C-alpha cells in the first residue's frame, strides 16, 4: 500500500542528495587538487576520479526528471544521446579509476623500490588514459544504437531502438535478446567483477603487508581500508546483482512477466550505486591531512 | 620583432622540459643525512662501485649520503637545508663511555638536539652504535657506572649495550611520527648497508601510506 | 695579538666624528622628499608605462 509510494520516491531523494553532495565535493576536490596543490601521481588519480564523479553527478537532474515520470524522456534526441554518453563514460571511468588507484597503492606498498624508481607524474599521466579509453570503447553502442522512440501516445522514451538495424518482423528476437544479454554480462564482468576483484585483492595485500611489518600503530589504517572496500561493495553489489539477475532472467521476464521484484528493485539499487559518486571524494580525498590543510587554508 | 619572441618562448619551453626531466631524475634518489664515532667506518661500509656527498646503490635503490662534519659553524643556521631527507644516520661510538664532559654524554646531547628538532619532526633516525668490540673489551675493566652512575646490571656487553640503546631511544620525545632503528655496527660484509636499505624501505612505505591516506 | 687588535679597533672606533641624530633624521627626510616622485612603489605608475602590465 503506502510502502510502494515510499519505494517510489526513495530513489528520487537519494539521487537528489547524491547530486548535491557529489557536485559540491567533486568541485571542491577538483579546485583544490588541481589549483592549490603540487602535481603528484596520487593527486592526478584523485583529479581524474573527481572529474568522472562530477561529470556523472552533473547529469543527475536529467535522470531524476526522467525517472520521476516513468522512464520517459522529455528532452530531445541530442540530449538523450549526450546525457547517456556522459553517464556511461563517467560511470565506467569511476570504477576503472577506483581499480587504478587500488593498483597504484598496492604497487607503492608491495614494491617500494620499483615505485621509487619508476612511478613518475609523466608516466602516471600516460597510463591513466587507459581507463578512459576502455570507458569510451564501452560507450560506443550509446553513440550508435541509442535513440529516442515516440510510441503512439507521444511518450518519447530514449531507448535502444533496433528497427533500423532489423530487416524482418522478428528482428526483436535473437537481435535484441542477444545484445541485451551481452550488455548485462559485460556490465557484471567488467563493471563489477574486475574492479571489485582488483580492489579486494590489492587492499587485502596492503593490509597483510602492513600487518606483517608491524606498521599498524592506530586503528585508522584498517578503518580507512575497510571503509574503502566496503563502500564500493555495498554501493555496487546490490545493483549489479539485480541487473545480472535481470540479464539471466530476461527472456522469461519479458515474455511472461515472472520476476516483477527484479523489475521494481532497479531504481532503489541503482540510486544506491550512484551514491558512490558523492561518497568517493570523502573516501579518497577528504581523508588526507595535507588535502584537508590545503582546503582549510584556501577557505 | 616577433620571430625572436617565439624563439625565446621555444627556448624557455625547452628549458622547462629539461627542468622537469632533471627533477624526475633527482626525485629517484634517497637523501640521507649523516651525523655524529666511526662515521668514516660507516662511510667505508656504504662504499660500492664543506659538505661531502657519497652516492651508492643497493638492490636497485640509489642513496645520496651527506656528511657535514667539516661545518664548524652554527648548525641551526643551515640545518633546515636538510628538512626533507628520507632519514638521518647517527653514529655513536660505544667505547666513548670512558672518554672525557663525557664523550657519550656529549653524543647523547647532540642526538637529543637532532632528534627533537623542529625540522625533523617526522624524519626517521638510523642510529649506529659503533666500536662494539672495543666496547666489549673495555666493559670488562671499566664499569658502565663510570659513565652512568644509575646503571645496576652486570659488566656484560649484552646488558651494558641494551642499556645504552634504550637510553638513547628514550630521548625520542615524539614516538608517534618517527622511528629509531638501532644497529650495533659489525664488520660483517653488507650488513650495515642492508640494515640501511631495510630502514629506508620502511620509511618509503610509510611515506607512501601517509601520502595515499592510510597513515 | 688579539688583545692588541681589539684595543686598536676600539680606539679607532672611539676616535670618530659623530653628528646629531636630528641632523641624520633631517638628511633622511630630505632624501626621501627629494626622490619621492621617482618611486614607482610609493606612487604607482599608470598602466600605460607599467612594464608588468
Amino acid at each position: 500500500s503506502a510502502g510502494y509510494t515510499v519505494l517510489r520516491i526513495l530513489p528520487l531523494v537519494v539521487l537528489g542528495v547524491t547530486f548535491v553532495l557529489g557536485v559540491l565535493g567533486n568541485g571542491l576536490v577538483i579546485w583544490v587538487a588541481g589549483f592549490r596543490m603540487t602535481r603528484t601521481v596520487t593527486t592526478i588519480c584523485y583529479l581524474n576520479l573527481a572529474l568522472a564523479d562530477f561529470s556523472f553527478t552533473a547529469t543527475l537532474p536529467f535522470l531524476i526528471v526522467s525517472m520521476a515520470m516513468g522512464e520517459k524522456w522529455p528532452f530531445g534526441w541530442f540530449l538523450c544521446k549526450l546525457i547517456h554518453i556522459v553517464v556511461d563514460i563517467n560511470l565506467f571511468g569511476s570504477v576503472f579509476l577506483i581499480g587504478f588507484i587500488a593498483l597504484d597503492r598496492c604497487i607503492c606498498v608491495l614494491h617500494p623500490v620499483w615505485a621509487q624508481n619508476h612511478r613518475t607524474v609523466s608516466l602516471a599521466m600516460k597510463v591513466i588514459v587507459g581507463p578512459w579509453i576502455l570507458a569510451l570503447v564501452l560507450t560506443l553502442p550509446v553513440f550508435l544504437f541509442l535513440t529516442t522512440v515516440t510510441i503512439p501516445n507521444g511518450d518519447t522514451y530514449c531507448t535502444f531502438n533496433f528497427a533500423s538495424w532489423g530487416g524482418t518482423p522478428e528482428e526483436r528476437l535473437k537481435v535484441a535478446i542477444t545484445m541485451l544479454t551481452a550488455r548485462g554480462i559485460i556490465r557484471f564482468v567488467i563493471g563489477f567483477l574486475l574492479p571489485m576483484s582488483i580492489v579486494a585483492i590489492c587492499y587485502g595485500l596492503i593490509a597483510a603487508k602492513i600487518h606483517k611489518k608491524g606498521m599498524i600503530k592506530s586503528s585508522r589504517p584498517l578503518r580507512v581500508l575497510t571503509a574503502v572496500v566496503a563502500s564500493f561493495f555495498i554501493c555496487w553489489f546490490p545493483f549489479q546483482l539485480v541487473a545480472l539477475l535481470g540479464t539471466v532472467w530476461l527472456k522469461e521476464m519479458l515474455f511472461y512477466g515472472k520476476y516483477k521484484i527484479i523489475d521494481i528493485l532497479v531504481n532503489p539499487t541503482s540510486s544506491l550505486a550512484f551514491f558512490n559518486s558523492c561518497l568517493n571524494p570523502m573516501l579518497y580525498v577528504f581523508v588526507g591531512q595535507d588535502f584537508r590543510e590545503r582546503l582549510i587554508h584556501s577557505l | 620583432v616577433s620571430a625572436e619572441d617565439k624563439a625565446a618562448a621555444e627556448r624557455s619551453k625547452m628549458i622547462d622540459k629539461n627542468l622537469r626531466e632533471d627533477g624526475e631524475k633527482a626525485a629517484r634518489e634517497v637523501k640521507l643525512l649523516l651525523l655524529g664515532s666511526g662515521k668514516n667506518t660507516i662511510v667505508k661500509q656504504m662504499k660500492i662501485i664543506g659538505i661531502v656527498e657519497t652516492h651508492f646503490t643497493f638492490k636497485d635503490l640509489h642513496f645520496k649520503m651527506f656528511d657535514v662534519g667539516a661545518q664548524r659553524s652554527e648548525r641551526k643556521k643551515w640545518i633546515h637545508c636538510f628538512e626533507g631527507v628520507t632519514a638521518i644516520i647517527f653514529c655513536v661510538a660505544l667505547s666513548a663511555y670512558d672518554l672525557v664532559m663525557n664523550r657519550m654524554h656529549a653524543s647523547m646531547k647532540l642526538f637529543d638536539s637532532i632528534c627533537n628538532n623542529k625540522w625533523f619532526t617526522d624524519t626517521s633516525i638510523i642510529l649506529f652504535l659503533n666500536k662494539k668490540d672495543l666496547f666489549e673489551e673495555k666493559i670488562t675493566h671499566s664499569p658502565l657506572t663510570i659513565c652512568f652512575p644509575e646503571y645496576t646490571g652486570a659488566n656484560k656487553y649484552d646488558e651494558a649495550a641494551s642499556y645504552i640503546q634504550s637510553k638513547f631511544e628514550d630521548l625520542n620525545k615524539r614516538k608517534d611520527t618517527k622511528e629509531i632503528y638501532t644497529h650495533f655496527t659489525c664488520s660483517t660484509d653488507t650488513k650495515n648497508v642492508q640494515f640501511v636499505f631495510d630502514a629506508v624501505t620502511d620509511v618509503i612505505i610509510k611515506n607512501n601510506l601517509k601520502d595515499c591516506g592510510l597513515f | 695579538a688579539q688583545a692588541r687588535k681589539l684595543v686598536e679597533q676600539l680606539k679607532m672606533e672611539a676616535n670618530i666624528d659623530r653628528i646629531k641624530v636630528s641632523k641624520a633624521a633631517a638628511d633622511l627626510m630630505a632624501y626621501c622628499e627629494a626622490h619621492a616622485k621617482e618611486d614607482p612603489l610609493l606612487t604607482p605608475v599608470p598602466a600605460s608605462e607599467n612594464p608588468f602590465r
Partner: protein, 338 residues
C-alpha cells in the same frame, strides 16, 4: 696583563656609549612626527615565476631591471626574464646546497655559493653558446652566506666561518680578508659607491668595512638575536638590519647609533630579507610567517602586506628603477609585485 686590557676595553666601551648618548638628542620618530603617512601600500602579484622544484634560497635583480637570477636547492640557478616569465637560462650547480646568488652589474656574470664553502662564478656571455664556470673561489672554511659583485673582476663574500673576503676573480685569490665578528656572517650589502660595505652576523651585531683598507670602521649593536638580513639606504649613509628577534632596525653611519625599530606585537617570527624602495621611504621585509611586510621607513608604521606564498619568504629584491618587487619563497615560487 689580560685583566688590565679587559678593564680598558670595558672603559672604552663605556666611553663610546657615553659619546653616542651625548650625540643623541632627538629621535627619528620625533623628527618625522610632522610628515604624513604613506597610506596603505597595496601591491598585486603581477607575475608568478614557476619552475623551481625545491625551496628558493636567494635571488638577485639585474641592473637592467628586467632579468633576475634565482637559486634553488634543486641544484638550479635560473635566469628569468621578468616581463615575459621566460626562462633565459638554467645553470646546473655542482653543489645543490646553494645559499646565495649574485648578478654582476654588467650582467655578464652570475655567482652562487652555499654549503660547499665555494663561490662559483658563471660566465653568461659564452660566445660558444653554453654557460660555463669561469672561476671557482676557495679559501673560506665555512658555508658561503652572501656574495656581491663589485665589478666583473671583484666580488665580496661573507661566510659562516665568521669572516668576509674581497676576491680577485681573474687570479682567484683573496685580495683582502675582513675579520672581527664572533659569529657567522649571514648577509652583506655594498654601498652605492662600492667603497664600504655592511655585514650582519650571528653575534647580533653589524659592522662597516672599508673595501680598500680592510678594517672595521664602525660596529653597530642593539639586536637581540642573529642578524639574518642587511641592506643599504639608497643614499649610502644608513642601513637596515633584520634579525631573528622579529624586529628590523635602522642604523646611521654618521651618528653611529640606531635610529628606528620596525616591530609589531603580532609578529614573533624572524626576518629573512630586507630591501628598501627607490626613495628609501618603504622598507620591505620578508618573514618566516609566509608574508612580506612593507614598513614606512620614516614613521616606523606598517604600510602594507604581501601575502601570496605558502612557505617562508627567503629572498626579496627591488629593481634598480624601483618599478617592481620580486619575492622568492620556500614554496618554490617567485612573485613580481607592483
Amino acid at each position: 696583563e689580560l685583566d688590565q686590557l679587559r678593564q680598558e676595553a670595558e672603559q672604552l666601551k663605556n666611553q663610546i656609549r657615553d659619546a653616542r648618548k651625548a650625540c643623541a638628542d632627538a629621535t627619528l620618530s620625533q623628527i618625522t612626527n610632522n610628515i604624513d603617512p604613506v597610506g596603505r601600500i597595496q601591491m598585486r602579484t603581477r607575475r608568478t615565476l614557476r619552475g623551481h622544484l625545491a625551496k628558493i634560497y636567494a635571488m638577485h635583480w639585474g641592473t637592467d631591471s628586467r632579468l633576475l637570477v634565482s637559486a634553488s636547492q634543486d641544484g638550479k640557478l635560473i635566469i628569468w626574464d621578468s616581463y615575459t616569465t621566460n626562462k633565459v637560462h638554467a645553470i646546473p650547480l655542482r653543489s645543490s646546497w646553494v645559499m646565495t646568488c649574485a648578478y654582476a652589474p654588467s650582467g655578464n656574470y652570475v655567482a652562487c655559493g652555499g654549503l660547499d664553502n665555494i663561490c662559483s662564478i658563471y660566465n653568461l656571455k659564452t660566445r660558444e653558446g653554453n654557460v660555463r664556470v669561469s672561476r671557482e673561489l676557495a679559501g673560506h672554511t665555512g658555508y658561503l652566506s652572501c656574495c656581491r659583485f663589485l665589478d666583473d673582476n671583484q666580488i665580496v663574500t661573507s661566510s659562516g666561518d665568521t669572516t668576509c673576503a674581497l676576491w680577485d676573480i681573474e687570479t682567484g685569490q683573496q685580495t683582502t680578508t675582513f675579520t672581527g665578528h664572533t659569529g657567522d656572517v649571514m648577509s652583506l650589502s655594498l654601498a652605492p659607491d662600492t667603497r664600504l660595505f655592511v655585514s650582519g652576523a650571528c653575534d647580533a651585531s653589524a659592522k662597516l668595512w672599508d673595501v680598500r683598507e680592510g678594517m672595521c670602521r664602525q660596529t653597530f649593536t642593539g639586536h637581540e638575536s642573529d642578524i639574518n638580513a642587511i641592506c643599504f639606504f639608497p643614499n649610502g649613509n644608513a642601513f637596515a638590519t633584520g634579525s631573528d628577534d622579529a624586529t628590523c632596525r635602522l642604523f646611521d653611519l654618521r651618528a653611529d647609533q640606531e635610529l628606528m625599530t620596525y616591530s609589531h606585537d603580532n609578529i614573533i617570527c624572524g626576518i629573512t630579507s630586507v630591501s628598501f624602495s627607490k626613495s628609501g621611504r618603504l622598507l620591505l621585509a620578508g618573514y618566516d610567517d609566509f608574508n612580506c611586510n612593507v614598513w614606512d621607513a620614516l614613521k616606523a608604521d606598517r604600510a602594507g602586506v604581501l601575502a601570496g606564498h605558502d612557505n617562508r619568504v627567503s629572498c626579496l629584491g627591488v629593481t634598480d628603477d624601483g618599478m617592481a618587487v620580486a619575492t622568492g619563497s620556500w614554496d618554490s615560487f617567485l612573485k613580481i609585485w607592483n
